[PDB]
Design an enzyme around this catalytic site. Structure first.
Site, PDB file in Angstrom:
ATOM      1  N   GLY A  30       0.808  -1.203   0.000  1.00 42.43           N
ATOM      2  CA  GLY A  30       0.000   0.000   0.000  1.00 42.43           C
ATOM      3  C   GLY A  30       0.848   1.263   0.000  1.00 42.43           C
ATOM      4  O   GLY A  30       2.064   1.244   0.206  1.00 42.43           O
ATOM      5  N   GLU A  31       0.157   2.370  -0.286  1.00 39.15           N
ATOM      6  CA  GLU A  31       0.647   3.746  -0.146  1.00 39.15           C
ATOM      7  C   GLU A  31       0.670   4.267   1.277  1.00 39.15           C
ATOM      8  O   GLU A  31      -0.388   4.456   1.860  1.00 39.15           O
ATOM      9  CB  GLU A  31      -0.247   4.679  -0.956  1.00 39.15           C
ATOM     10  CG  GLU A  31       0.129   4.777  -2.360  1.00 39.15           C
ATOM     11  CD  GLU A  31       1.435   5.476  -2.430  1.00 39.15           C
ATOM     12  OE1 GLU A  31       2.323   4.998  -3.158  1.00 39.15           O
ATOM     13  OE2 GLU A  31       1.580   6.507  -1.748  1.00 39.15           O
ATOM     14  N   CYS A  33       2.147   7.720   3.747  1.00 44.28           N
ATOM     15  CA  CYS A  33       2.197   9.156   3.450  1.00 44.28           C
ATOM     16  C   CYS A  33       3.509   9.546   2.770  1.00 44.28           C
ATOM     17  O   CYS A  33       3.538  10.509   1.999  1.00 44.28           O
ATOM     18  CB  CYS A  33       2.061  10.020   4.692  1.00 44.28           C
ATOM     19  SG  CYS A  33       3.066   9.460   6.003  1.00 44.28           S
ATOM     20  N   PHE A  34       4.603   8.845   3.055  1.00 40.19           N
ATOM     21  CA  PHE A  34       5.891   9.212   2.473  1.00 40.19           C
ATOM     22  C   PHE A  34       6.214   8.477   1.176  1.00 40.19           C
ATOM     23  O   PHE A  34       7.196   8.839   0.516  1.00 40.19           O
ATOM     24  CB  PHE A  34       7.030   8.957   3.478  1.00 40.19           C
ATOM     25  CG  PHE A  34       6.781   9.555   4.837  1.00 40.19           C
ATOM     26  CD1 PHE A  34       6.344  10.863   4.965  1.00 40.19           C
ATOM     27  CD2 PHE A  34       6.988   8.803   5.986  1.00 40.19           C
ATOM     28  CE1 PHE A  34       6.111  11.412   6.219  1.00 40.19           C
ATOM     29  CE2 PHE A  34       6.756   9.348   7.247  1.00 40.19           C
ATOM     30  CZ  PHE A  34       6.315  10.655   7.354  1.00 40.19           C
ATOM     31  N   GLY A  35       5.456   7.459   0.801  1.00 39.27           N
ATOM     32  CA  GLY A  35       5.837   6.628  -0.331  1.00 39.27           C
ATOM     33  C   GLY A  35       5.245   5.240  -0.174  1.00 39.27           C
ATOM     34  O   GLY A  35       4.507   4.961   0.774  1.00 39.27           O
ATOM     35  N   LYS A  59       9.374   0.656   4.198  1.00 36.49           N
ATOM     36  CA  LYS A  59       8.799   1.971   3.954  1.00 36.49           C
ATOM     37  C   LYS A  59       9.767   2.764   3.088  1.00 36.49           C
ATOM     38  O   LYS A  59      10.947   2.916   3.445  1.00 36.49           O
ATOM     39  CB  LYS A  59       8.529   2.700   5.273  1.00 36.49           C
ATOM     40  CG  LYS A  59       7.619   1.910   6.224  1.00 36.49           C
ATOM     41  CD  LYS A  59       7.452   2.684   7.579  1.00 36.49           C
ATOM     42  CE  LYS A  59       6.116   3.441   7.646  1.00 36.49           C
ATOM     43  NZ  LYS A  59       6.215   4.841   8.227  1.00 36.49           N
ATOM     44  N   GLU A 107       8.360  -4.126  11.058  1.00 38.00           N
ATOM     45  CA  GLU A 107       7.778  -5.467  11.074  1.00 38.00           C
ATOM     46  C   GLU A 107       6.646  -5.644  10.062  1.00 38.00           C
ATOM     47  O   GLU A 107       5.868  -4.732   9.780  1.00 38.00           O
ATOM     48  CB  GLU A 107       7.279  -5.852  12.474  1.00 38.00           C
ATOM     49  CG  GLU A 107       8.419  -6.117  13.457  1.00 38.00           C
ATOM     50  CD  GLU A 107       7.941  -6.333  14.884  1.00 38.00           C
ATOM     51  OE1 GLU A 107       7.010  -5.611  15.344  1.00 38.00           O
ATOM     52  OE2 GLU A 107       8.497  -7.226  15.559  1.00 38.00           O
ATOM     53  N   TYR A 108       6.549  -6.873   9.549  1.00 41.89           N
ATOM     54  CA  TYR A 108       5.494  -7.299   8.636  1.00 41.89           C
ATOM     55  C   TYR A 108       4.389  -8.005   9.420  1.00 41.89           C
ATOM     56  O   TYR A 108       4.657  -8.928  10.200  1.00 41.89           O
ATOM     57  CB  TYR A 108       6.085  -8.241   7.595  1.00 41.89           C
ATOM     58  CG  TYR A 108       5.065  -8.924   6.681  1.00 41.89           C
ATOM     59  CD1 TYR A 108       4.219  -8.167   5.866  1.00 41.89           C
ATOM     60  CD2 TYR A 108       5.000 -10.313   6.607  1.00 41.89           C
ATOM     61  CE1 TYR A 108       3.300  -8.782   4.983  1.00 41.89           C
ATOM     62  CE2 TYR A 108       4.096 -10.950   5.720  1.00 41.89           C
ATOM     63  CZ  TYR A 108       3.257 -10.169   4.917  1.00 41.89           C
ATOM     64  OH  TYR A 108       2.369 -10.791   4.067  1.00 41.89           O
ATOM     65  N   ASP A 168      -3.699   9.370  16.791  1.00 40.56           N
ATOM     66  CA  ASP A 168      -4.690   8.847  15.829  1.00 40.56           C
ATOM     67  C   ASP A 168      -4.895   7.343  16.045  1.00 40.56           C
ATOM     68  O   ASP A 168      -4.800   6.533  15.123  1.00 40.56           O
ATOM     69  CB  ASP A 168      -4.262   9.154  14.391  1.00 40.56           C
ATOM     70  CG  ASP A 168      -5.374   8.866  13.352  1.00 40.56           C
ATOM     71  OD1 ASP A 168      -6.603   8.870  13.667  1.00 40.56           O
ATOM     72  OD2 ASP A 168      -5.002   8.627  12.192  1.00 40.56           O
ATOM     73  N   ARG A 172      -7.861   1.092  11.984  1.00 40.16           N
ATOM     74  CA  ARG A 172      -7.052   1.052  10.758  1.00 40.16           C
ATOM     75  C   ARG A 172      -5.551   1.215  11.019  1.00 40.16           C
ATOM     76  O   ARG A 172      -4.751   0.875  10.142  1.00 40.16           O
ATOM     77  CB  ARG A 172      -7.532   2.115   9.752  1.00 40.16           C
ATOM     78  CG  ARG A 172      -8.844   1.675   9.053  1.00 40.16           C
ATOM     79  CD  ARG A 172      -9.068   2.376   7.701  1.00 40.16           C
ATOM     80  NE  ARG A 172      -7.976   2.050   6.794  1.00 40.16           N
ATOM     81  CZ  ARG A 172      -8.009   1.063   5.914  1.00 40.16           C
ATOM     82  NH1 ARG A 172      -9.119   0.369   5.692  1.00 40.16           N
ATOM     83  NH2 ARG A 172      -6.896   0.749   5.255  1.00 40.16           N
ATOM     84  N   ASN A 173      -5.148   1.715  12.199  1.00 43.57           N
ATOM     85  CA  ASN A 173      -3.744   1.905  12.544  1.00 43.57           C
ATOM     86  C   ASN A 173      -3.232   0.806  13.460  1.00 43.57           C
ATOM     87  O   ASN A 173      -2.207   0.976  14.120  1.00 43.57           O
ATOM     88  CB  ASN A 173      -3.540   3.291  13.188  1.00 43.57           C
ATOM     89  CG  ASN A 173      -3.681   4.397  12.180  1.00 43.57           C
ATOM     90  OD1 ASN A 173      -3.470   4.166  10.994  1.00 43.57           O
ATOM     91  ND2 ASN A 173      -4.052   5.600  12.627  1.00 43.57           N
ATOM     92  N   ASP A 186       2.224   3.672  13.531  1.00 36.60           N
ATOM     93  CA  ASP A 186       2.199   5.138  13.439  1.00 36.60           C
ATOM     94  C   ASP A 186       2.349   5.841  14.785  1.00 36.60           C
ATOM     95  O   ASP A 186       2.023   7.020  14.900  1.00 36.60           O
ATOM     96  CB  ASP A 186       0.927   5.656  12.762  1.00 36.60           C
ATOM     97  CG  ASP A 186       0.940   5.455  11.263  1.00 36.60           C
ATOM     98  OD1 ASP A 186       2.016   5.146  10.692  1.00 36.60           O
ATOM     99  OD2 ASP A 186      -0.124   5.649  10.660  1.00 36.60           O
TER     100      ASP A 186
END
Ligand SMILES: *CCC(=O)Nc1ccc2c(-c3c[nH]c4ncc(-c5cnn(CCN6CCOCC6)c5)nc34)cn(C)c2c1
Length: 309
Positions: A30-31, A33-35, A59, A107-108, A168, A172-173, A186
């Protein structure tokens, strides 16, 4: 060959630096915020076991990133080092700062974010919205659900002990690993120095205003107490198996309603005790909310007493 040398002074830390030829890049995750974030196999990540391969998440910095973007990704990587490792956070594993573009390796968590993990495990029937997954998975027990909450609370207790504010905290985080471990993402992000747009969705369609404590909505004040408010919203997300907060409520109306004492109703499949915990996290007065230490102790007891049948 000065070709492709960074114009910046990227910080090489010998404890963490990995040669990028030790990474075999795989599928997109996925996308960010930085790439992009991409799945990779890392060879010899542990210097004890140099012939072993580990799956990791890489990342990356987009090619058109700004200097603020570069500085923010570096700041997150350094903050992860200072905060240290915990089972229930997304941990730093290494970095590639030499010989090409900046990579931060973390980590994955193979099962992806907690909202979609719970949605794919919705059973049929009256208590939950429909299961949107074309690969639905076995439903969780009541004990599994409380254990999800416990694991996030334990991770937040650790982060608060290190004086880290998340700002936040939302389903989702939170990412879920192959072994169903909850891991908070995050937590190390630097705070934006600019005012925020309350009506701008994330790239995944989410409105973060719905997790904001009223003092963060009204006055942009974030403390460990406002993270506890968000944890209450995350509890509601868990017991709706990935539901969307404040159903039917336009976001421009949210602060008025909260200020008047509106709170989300109890989910159909939720004990009185867990709903009371949610409501305590949503105390109007920040000082009167429970701490993460207290949430951890209470959830530990509740997990023990909740059936896995
Ligand atoms: C600006 C803030 C930001 O960009 N943060 C950010 C942080 C972490 C990540 C990831 C990330 C990190 N680690 C991961 N492990 C796994 C995954 C992941 C993504 N999709 N899946 C698969 C989900 N399917 C569902 C269907 O069944 C099979 C599994 C796993 N993502 C990870 C990724 N991104 C974008 C960020 C951003």
């Amino acid at each position: 060959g000065p070709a492709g040398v960074s114009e910046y002074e990227l910080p090489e830390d010998p404890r963490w630096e990995l040669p990028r030829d030790r990474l075999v890049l795989g599928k997109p995750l996925g996308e960010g915020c930085f790439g992009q974030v991409v799945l990779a196999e890392a060879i010899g990540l542990d210097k004890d076991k140099p012939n072993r391969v580990t799956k990791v998440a890489v990342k990356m910095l987009k090619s058109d990133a700004t200097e603020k973007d570069l500085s923010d990704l570096i700041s997150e990587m350094e903050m992860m080092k200072m905060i240290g490792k915990h089972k229930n956070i997304i941990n730093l594993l290494g970095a590639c700062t030499q010989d090409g573009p900046l990579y931060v390796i973390v980590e994955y968590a193979s099962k992806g974010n907690l909202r979609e993990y719970l949605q794919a495990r919705r059973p049929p029937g009256l208590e939950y919205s429909y299961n949107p997954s074309h690969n639905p998975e076995e439903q969780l027990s009541s004990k599994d659900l409380v254990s999800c909450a416990y694991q996030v609370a334990r991770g937040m207790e650790y982060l608060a002990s290190k004086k880290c504010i998340h700002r936040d905290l939302a389903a989702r985080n939170v990412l879920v690993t192959e072994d169903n471990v909850m891991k908070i993402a995050d937590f190390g992000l630097a705070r934006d120095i600019h005012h925020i747009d309350y009506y701008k969705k994330t790239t995944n369609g989410r409105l973060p205003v719905k997790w904001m404590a009223p003092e963060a909505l009204f006055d942009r004040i974030y403390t460990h107490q406002s993270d506890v408010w968000s944890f209450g919203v995350l509890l509601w997300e868990i017991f709706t198996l990935g539901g969307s907060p404040y159903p039917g409520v336009p976001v421009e109306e949210l602060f008025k309603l909260l200020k008047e004492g509106h709170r989300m109703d109890k989910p159909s499949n939720c004990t009185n005790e867990l709903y009371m915990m949610m409501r305590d996290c949503w105390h109007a007065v920040p000082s009167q909310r429970p701490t993460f230490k207290q949430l951890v102790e209470d959830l530990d007891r509740i997990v023990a007493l909740t059936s896995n049948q």
